[PDB]
Design a protein around this motif. Structure first.
Motif, PDB file in Angstrom:
ATOM      1  N   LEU A 166       0.873  -1.074  -0.019  1.00 40.68           N
ATOM      2  CA  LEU A 166       0.121   0.121  -0.072  1.00 40.68           C
ATOM      3  C   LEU A 166       0.793   1.305  -0.062  1.00 40.68           C
ATOM      4  O   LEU A 166       1.923   1.198   0.733  1.00 40.68           O
ATOM      5  N   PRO A 167       0.441   2.285  -0.650  1.00 39.26           N
ATOM      6  CA  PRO A 167       0.963   3.576  -0.622  1.00 39.26           C
ATOM      7  C   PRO A 167       0.815   3.728   0.780  1.00 39.26           C
ATOM      8  O   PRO A 167      -0.102   3.638   1.584  1.00 39.26           O
ATOM      9  N   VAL A 168       1.692   4.825   1.506  1.00 43.22           N
ATOM     10  CA  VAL A 168       1.807   5.157   2.788  1.00 43.22           C
ATOM     11  C   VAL A 168       0.485   5.717   3.399  1.00 43.22           C
ATOM     12  O   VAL A 168       0.249   5.302   4.424  1.00 43.22           O
ATOM     13  N   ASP A 169      -0.270   6.353   2.771  1.00 40.28           N
ATOM     14  CA  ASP A 169      -1.596   6.790   3.305  1.00 40.28           C
ATOM     15  C   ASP A 169      -2.853   5.910   3.473  1.00 40.28           C
ATOM     16  O   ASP A 169      -3.311   5.752   4.451  1.00 40.28           O
ATOM     17  N   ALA A 170      -2.646   4.885   2.395  1.00 36.79           N
ATOM     18  CA  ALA A 170      -3.588   3.664   2.497  1.00 36.79           C
ATOM     19  C   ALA A 170      -2.931   2.885   3.567  1.00 36.79           C
ATOM     20  O   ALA A 170      -3.948   2.373   4.378  1.00 36.79           O
ATOM     21  N   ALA A 171      -1.797   2.653   3.630  1.00 34.29           N
ATOM     22  CA  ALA A 171      -1.350   1.865   4.768  1.00 34.29           C
ATOM     23  C   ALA A 171      -1.690   2.346   6.170  1.00 34.29           C
ATOM     24  O   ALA A 171      -2.190   1.695   7.116  1.00 34.29           O
ATOM     25  N   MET A 172      -1.532   3.659   6.191  1.00 35.01           N
ATOM     26  CA  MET A 172      -2.126   4.435   7.646  1.00 35.01           C
ATOM     27  C   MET A 172      -3.407   4.090   7.903  1.00 35.01           C
ATOM     28  O   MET A 172      -3.713   3.754   9.071  1.00 35.01           O
ATOM     29  N   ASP A 173      -4.335   3.958   6.948  1.00 35.42           N
ATOM     30  CA  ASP A 173      -5.693   3.708   7.255  1.00 35.42           C
ATOM     31  C   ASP A 173      -5.969   2.055   7.714  1.00 35.42           C
ATOM     32  O   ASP A 173      -6.591   1.673   8.350  1.00 35.42           O
ATOM     33  N   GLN A 174      -5.233   1.329   7.172  1.00 32.56           N
ATOM     34  CA  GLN A 174      -5.128  -0.086   7.296  1.00 32.56           C
ATOM     35  C   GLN A 174      -4.489  -0.628   8.735  1.00 32.56           C
ATOM     36  O   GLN A 174      -5.295  -1.586   9.232  1.00 32.56           O
ATOM     37  N   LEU A 175      -4.019   0.059   9.229  1.00 39.59           N
ATOM     38  CA  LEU A 175      -3.036  -0.124  10.203  1.00 39.59           C
ATOM     39  C   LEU A 175      -3.912   0.233  11.618  1.00 39.59           C
ATOM     40  O   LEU A 175      -4.014   1.503  11.681  1.00 39.59           O
ATOM     41  N   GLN A 176      -4.902  -0.375  12.030  1.00 39.25           N
ATOM     42  CA  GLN A 176      -5.706   0.008  13.194  1.00 39.25           C
ATOM     43  C   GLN A 176      -4.846   0.022  14.535  1.00 39.25           C
ATOM     44  O   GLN A 176      -5.364   0.423  15.629  1.00 39.25           O
ATOM     45  N   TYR A 177      -3.705  -0.376  14.768  1.00 36.11           N
ATOM     46  CA  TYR A 177      -2.884  -0.278  15.984  1.00 36.11           C
ATOM     47  C   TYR A 177      -2.196   1.189  16.023  1.00 36.11           C
ATOM     48  O   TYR A 177      -1.586   1.350  15.453  1.00 36.11           O
ATOM     49  N   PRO A 178      -2.514   1.978  16.880  1.00 35.74           N
ATOM     50  CA  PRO A 178      -1.837   3.308  17.095  1.00 35.74           C
ATOM     51  C   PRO A 178      -0.286   3.141  17.040  1.00 35.74           C
ATOM     52  O   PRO A 178       0.364   4.003  16.582  1.00 35.74           O
ATOM     53  N   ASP A 179       0.449   2.291  17.752  1.00 35.71           N
ATOM     54  CA  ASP A 179       1.757   2.133  17.805  1.00 35.71           C
ATOM     55  C   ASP A 179       2.272   1.851  16.415  1.00 35.71           C
ATOM     56  O   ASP A 179       3.416   2.334  16.075  1.00 35.71           O
ATOM     57  N   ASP A 180       1.630   0.947  15.515  1.00 33.00           N
ATOM     58  CA  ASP A 180       2.170   0.859  14.214  1.00 33.00           C
ATOM     59  C   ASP A 180       2.081   2.053  13.160  1.00 33.00           C
ATOM     60  O   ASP A 180       2.823   2.371  12.448  1.00 33.00           O
ATOM     61  N   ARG A 181       0.795   2.737  13.531  1.00 34.50           N
ATOM     62  CA  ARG A 181       0.743   4.301  12.723  1.00 34.50           C
ATOM     63  C   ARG A 181       1.852   5.233  13.071  1.00 34.50           C
ATOM     64  O   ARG A 181       2.505   5.773  12.446  1.00 34.50           O
ATOM     65  N   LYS A 182       2.244   5.002  14.393  1.00 31.35           N
ATOM     66  CA  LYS A 182       3.350   6.064  14.917  1.00 31.35           C
ATOM     67  C   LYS A 182       4.591   5.421  14.495  1.00 31.35           C
ATOM     68  O   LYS A 182       5.661   6.172  13.823  1.00 31.35           O
ATOM     69  N   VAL A 183       5.043   4.193  14.276  1.00 30.85           N
ATOM     70  CA  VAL A 183       6.284   3.857  13.649  1.00 30.85           C
ATOM     71  C   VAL A 183       6.199   4.230  11.939  1.00 30.85           C
ATOM     72  O   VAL A 183       7.286   4.564  11.360  1.00 30.85           O
ATOM     73  N   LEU A 184       4.862   3.979  11.345  1.00 24.71           N
ATOM     74  CA  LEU A 184       4.913   4.576   9.933  1.00 24.71           C
ATOM     75  C   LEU A 184       5.146   5.952   9.893  1.00 24.71           C
ATOM     76  O   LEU A 184       5.835   6.486   8.918  1.00 24.71           O
ATOM     77  N   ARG A 185       4.789   6.905  10.847  1.00 20.48           N
ATOM     78  CA  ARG A 185       4.846   8.251  10.767  1.00 20.48           C
ATOM     79  C   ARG A 185       6.491   8.591  10.853  1.00 20.48           C
ATOM     80  O   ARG A 185       7.127   9.441  10.123  1.00 20.48           O
ATOM     81  N   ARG A 186       7.134   7.767  11.799  1.00 22.64           N
ATOM     82  CA  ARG A 186       8.488   8.000  11.944  1.00 22.64           C
ATOM     83  C   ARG A 186       9.297   7.503  10.569  1.00 22.64           C
ATOM     84  O   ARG A 186      10.264   8.094  10.312  1.00 22.64           O
TER      85      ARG A 186
END
Ligand SMILES: Nc1nc2c([nH]c(=O)n2[C@H]2C[C@H](O)[C@@H](COP(=O)(O)OP(=O)(O)O)O2)c(=O)[nH]1
Length: 290
Positions: free
Chosen positions: A102-122
């Motif tokens: 997934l492109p990063v924005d679609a991946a961000m929506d797919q990841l429902q755990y907050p910590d995984d979204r945090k890692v992706l923001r990093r």
């Protein structure tokens, strides 16, 4: 009680896509991760988890911080890396039944755990298509006072030879391609097992010894940049009195902050570069230390 784990943001050019994995144990989507085996380092575990959970090979780049999870009477700590896919194909396996890119924005929506979204923001904070310089302090080599001969020639000890062996998998995980060592036997011996693995000679570096550096920092810094400018991912094995000043200098010039720090024998600084400029400085423990 601290359980050590590691994980990754596995990515490829489509323009970047990231892998998100589905786990039937909880019926949901996340990032590759798992616990370290006995004797394993975090980077090696991250790459192993990529292999087992996604079927891909990859080369690790920048570290993406940690996440901490509560477990009974302690914590599980997961260190993450950016990891560029280099091949392999996904097949359903004992942990993961599906994988999507997934492109990063679609991946961000797919990841429902907050910590995984945090890692992706990093992950998106800095470039990920990076080249890597691996600065290694040589392994353990006894005490100077017990060695009567030319101290240039003092060899690694048993423990240090084991650290040199263990650094092969550590440094391979970052895609090391070329090898450099200060003009001391203990520095060359630290990377000789890797030299055998890569079929690469070790390039000698007189400017990067303690005595050279103490007399001329500027030549050492200039030499480091020359080495780093060549294509490829160089390993540079040097000494305790050399590394801190070089790392600090480079971090200052690039406005990069290391999340962790140290200078133990056998430790590695992973220096991630984008277009020649430092974007990460990640200190790794000696392979036989937490
Ligand atoms: N840095 C340094 N350490 C010394 C000296 N003399 C001495 O006995 N030591 C002691 C104190 C240091 O803690 C120790 C360094 O061990 P080593 O395997 O030489 O590592 P390195 O190549 O320096 O990274 O040796 C010296 O002139 N310089």
């Amino acid at each position: 009680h601290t359980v050590r784990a590691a994980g990754a943001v596995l990515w490829r050019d489509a323009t970047v896509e990231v892998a998100v994995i589905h786990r039937p144990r909880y019926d949901d989507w996340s990032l590759p991760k798992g616990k370290l085996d006995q004797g394993e380092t975090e980077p090696v575990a991250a790459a192993r988890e990529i292999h087992e959970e996604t079927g891909h090979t990859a080369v690790l780049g920048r570290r993406l911080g940690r996440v901490t999870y509560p477990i009974p009477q302690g914590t599980k700590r997961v260190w993450y890396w950016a990891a560029k896919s280099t091949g392999g194909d996904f097949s359903p396996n004992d942990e993961v039944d599906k994988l999507v890119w997934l492109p990063v924005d679609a991946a961000m929506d797919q990841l429902q755990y907050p910590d995984d979204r945090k890692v992706l923001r990093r992950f998106v904070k800095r470039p990920v298509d990076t080249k890597t310089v691996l600065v290694v302090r040589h392994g353990t080599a006894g005490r100077r006072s017990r060695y009567k001969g030319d101290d240039r020639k003092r060899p690694l000890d048993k423990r240090g030879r084991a650290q040199a062996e263990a650094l092969v998998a550590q440094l391979m995980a970052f895609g090391a391609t070329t090898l450099y060592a200060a003009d001391r036997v203990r520095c060359h011996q630290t990377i000789e097992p890797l030299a055998q693995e890569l079929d690469q000679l070790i390039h000698n570096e007189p400017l990067l010894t303690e005595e050279a550096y103490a007399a001329d920092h500027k030549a050492a810094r200039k030499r480091l940049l020359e080495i780093a400018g060549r294509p490829g991912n160089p390993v540079i094995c040097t000494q305790g009195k050399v590394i801190p000043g070089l790392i600090e200098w480079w971090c200052e010039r690039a406005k990069v902050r290391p999340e962790t720090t140290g200078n133990r024998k056998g430790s590695t600084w992973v220096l991630s570069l984008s277009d020649g400029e430092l974007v990460g400085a990640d200190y790794l423990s000696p392979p036989d230390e937490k």
